[PDB]
Paper text:
Reverse transcriptase (RT) from the [name] virus continues to be an attractive drug target for antiretroviral therapy. The drugs that target [name]-1 RT are divided into two classes: nucleoside reverse transcriptase inhibitors (NRTIs) and non-nucleoside reverse transcriptase inhibitors (NNRTIs). NNRTIs significantly inhibit the catalytic function of RT by binding in the non-nucleoside inhibitor binding pocket (NNIBP). The compounds co-crystallized bind the NNIBP causing RT to adopt an “open” conformation commonly observed for RT NNRTI complexes.
The attachment of a longer propoxy morpholine to DATA compound 2 retained potency for RT (WT), RT ([name]), and RT (K103N/[name]) variants. We compared 3 crystal structures of compound 2 in complex with RT (WT), RT ([name]), and RT (K103N/[name]) to examine interactions that promote affinity for [name] and K103N/[name] variants. Key interactions such as the 2 hydrogen bonds with K101 are maintained in the RT ([name]) and RT (K103N/[name]) crystal structures. In both RT ([name]) and RT (K103N/[name]) structures, the absence of Y181 causes the DATA scaffold to shift toward aromatic residues Y183, Y188, and W229 to make van der Waals contacts. Antiviral data also complements the analysis from the structures as compound 2 retains nanomolar potency for the virus containing wild-type RT and variants with [name] and K103N/[name] mutations (WT: 0.0012 µM; [name]: 0.012 µM [name]/K103N: 0.0013 µM). Compound 2 retains affinity for RT (WT), RT ([name]), and RT (K103N/[name]) variants. Crystal structures reveal that 2 can maintain most interactions observed in the RT (WT) structure and new interactions with Cys181 of the RT ([name]) variant are present. The addition of the propoxy linked morpholine also provides potential new interactions while improving solubility.
Residue numbers in the entry:
A (entry chain B): 5 to 88, 94 to 212, 232 to 428
B (entry chain A): -1 to 64, 71 to 216, 225 to 552
The structure:
Amino acid sequence: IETVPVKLKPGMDGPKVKQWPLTEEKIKALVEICTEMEKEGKISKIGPENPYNTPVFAIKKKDSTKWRKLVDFRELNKRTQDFWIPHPAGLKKKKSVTVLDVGDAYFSVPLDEDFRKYTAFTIPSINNETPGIRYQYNVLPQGWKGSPAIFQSSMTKILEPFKKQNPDIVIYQYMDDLYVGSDLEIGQHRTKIEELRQHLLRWYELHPDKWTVQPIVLPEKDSWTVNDIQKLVGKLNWASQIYPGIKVRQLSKLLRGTKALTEVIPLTEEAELELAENREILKEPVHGVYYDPSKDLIAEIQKQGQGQWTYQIYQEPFKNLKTGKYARMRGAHTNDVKQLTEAVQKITTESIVIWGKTPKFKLPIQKETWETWWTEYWQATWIPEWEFVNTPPLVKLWYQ
Amino acid sequence: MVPISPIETVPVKLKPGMDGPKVKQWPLTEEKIKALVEICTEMEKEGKISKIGPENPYNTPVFAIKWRKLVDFRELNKRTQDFWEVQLGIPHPAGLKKKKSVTVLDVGDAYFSVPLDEDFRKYTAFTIPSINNETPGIRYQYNVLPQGWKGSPAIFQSSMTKILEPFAAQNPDIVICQYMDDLYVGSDLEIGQHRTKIEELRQHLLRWGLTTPPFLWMGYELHPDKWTVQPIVLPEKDSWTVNDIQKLVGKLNWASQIYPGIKVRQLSKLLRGTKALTEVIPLTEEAELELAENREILKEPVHGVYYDPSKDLIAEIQKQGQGQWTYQIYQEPFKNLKTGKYARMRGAHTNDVKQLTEAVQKITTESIVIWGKTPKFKLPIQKETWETWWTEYWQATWIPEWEFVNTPPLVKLWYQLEKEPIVGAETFYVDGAANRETKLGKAGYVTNKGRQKVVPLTNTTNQKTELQAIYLALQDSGLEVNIVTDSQYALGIIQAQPDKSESELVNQIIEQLIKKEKVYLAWVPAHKGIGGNEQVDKLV
Ligand SMILES: Cc1cc(/C=C/C#N)cc(C)c1Nc1nc(Nc2ccc(C#N)cc2)nc(OCCCN2CCOCC2)n1
């Protein structure tokens, strides 16, 4: 009921980010939504005295045909002091984790008047005709990094009964999302959540236990071709960049001479021992792999084709904190970019559950291609950072 | 007197830590001074400006060019804040709709009638030097938006929109615009009902105290039924300066939005890493024909139509050649809304598919800006070609809804690397080494059939010989062939699948691959003593 003082960082002005073009239907959906949001005092039209701007678009979520207003507060977020919960390391260990959209609750809290100028955004017009309808936020804006940190106080007071009623249920909050974990049974889990939905009214289901950190494996054949062994050695050589005592000399010895690629080379005892010793090494985890929360998390995605995608999360090269594999079919068999986007969401969501912050992605896609279409399949309320890799990584065939 | 609604002022501040302007008052002739005194008198009579005293330490210079008053806010603008864009980016004619009638109204009577924020008028203080400097010059400040000030256009058009807003949502059968001293309204209504609603507008502006084809607009010509560009003037001269090239290039790109087949590569090739205004630059035979073709294109006028939301939107792309593409956008055959082109990005290697994709993404972006939707595409590429490409492409890639059009040249795939090693195909282990300091090196291969070759090379590098050895392996082999290499560089290039390259070496590799039936291309790590893969034959 009282605006907490909010200011920017030393030597930084508010966000002046260009609004990218929106389609006709998304513009209508934003017009309809903002028209009402204005009436509820959530937003108020601003004049030309406000120079700042944060991009804004519209999406559609699961089991919902109603549009949602997405504001890309990425530039405004990195221009906020923040520093106002130690990440619950038990969330990634629960049988089931549920994700809830507690964004509506933020709109009951007024915003610091001096800061409202930085929450400026523009609903664009088609063909640069009329000037874009401009708004600023009066309440707490969804997606803003300062939104949950401020509401962190109010939220602790809301979930005070539920937590103490059952201290076996873990609860976490990142951006507009509330994450709830439980080792219970799904039927009782959904009702326990149904109980938590009515508990929130008066004031997507994951399974982290169905996931680990994928290892590196080598083939088990009875007869090996030259090409089979050439790949094997190639993988082992790459695996040596990570694991210590990986030796390839006894297998390389088999390749001596200049045989045909499809010719079968029988394994020697010296080599069979070496391959076996290499397996044992790969079985063990990676040595001295820790997580420094001061550094950036990097995600690398490799398109494997046939709906399959591989990824890795790390901070220092050859020191993965996690590696995974996807192949889901959410009615996207004809579209690579939709798959990539759903994959980026998935990874980012998982990244939130484990470390409590999103990673920086390296996407196997042209900047121009991605930038045109990704919003058309985005269904998350947060947005990570991303680079674009243009050189075909050899490591693709080493993670499959 | 009917009470005029007061236009709410937009609060203006300076930049943080900056004091207002304080420049010297420019010495004027007695003629210029006598002129300004009359103007500033009748302006003060019109309620535009007002007289002030010595309490205002801020000074703004003022000139007089012949009659007309000029105020130089060159230093105040350096001290005035930033405003919202409003609206950096003009509407494109191809997006507008056909209107049966368009009326013109005057807004020169209304510009000066827009108040300025009170606590900012003290920065607009200017001095009129009296005769012979024998008196303290007349001090004055503005009470409305000055012409030339940093924030005037933004506040003007903002307050203007705010006024027209009710008389626009209540009249969906009407369309308005602001350019520049005038106001333009259009409708498809009867000439009677149209002239009526214009009177309803003049009376709506009268409330705030405002009683005031073909059209030349932003380089376009706007007709009630169609649009085009204002005639493009290409400077004809035997001597071509660097500045005249950019003038020629800029005017050609402008014309390419409606004139189909416009090419601009050969003229843009002559602006690489050169920053000058004076240099008589020659032209190739490819450039002279190009400019002669453009003059042949611009010899007959062509018109674009307007957008009717009731119909499909369609974009058609054709390969011009040499990394150049052209597109036409329409709803009905032969009736373009607009045209345009796409030039390939500055790279070393590329293929037609990747370029076609880029053009589509450009058009798509351009389309959404103008019509707010994605168009259907007619593309010079067989579905299979696209089907093979994107499924196998290491990258993620996508093209919106589209259909194939059989208008050659067709975009195709010229070769496809095997997924698995080929049975019965000879296996060429290749390497290529080069001495860094002597620029000398070797490149060659050995095969499972005893076949060998090492070729000696002068003036070359490691990355060049590793390519070369593959070129040799390609050269001396059957229609089917496996190739092992240790060059992550050589593989990295071919796994990007170019059909054209800057390096002629690569181009020759490409030509070789094309002539082949099946090509498998394996990779191994070097110096791990991998047999077949010999370093001892090339390193020497
Ligand atoms: C009137 C006008 C005059 C000039 C310059 C004149 C000079 N000097 C410049 C502009 C830019 C406009 N403004 C305008 N003009 C048209 N049609 C039109 C027809 C014939 C002629 C002629 N001859 C000229 C114009 N249509 C529209 O918009 C319609 C679509 C609206 N929606 C809104 C929601 O999103 C979708 C688009 N705006």
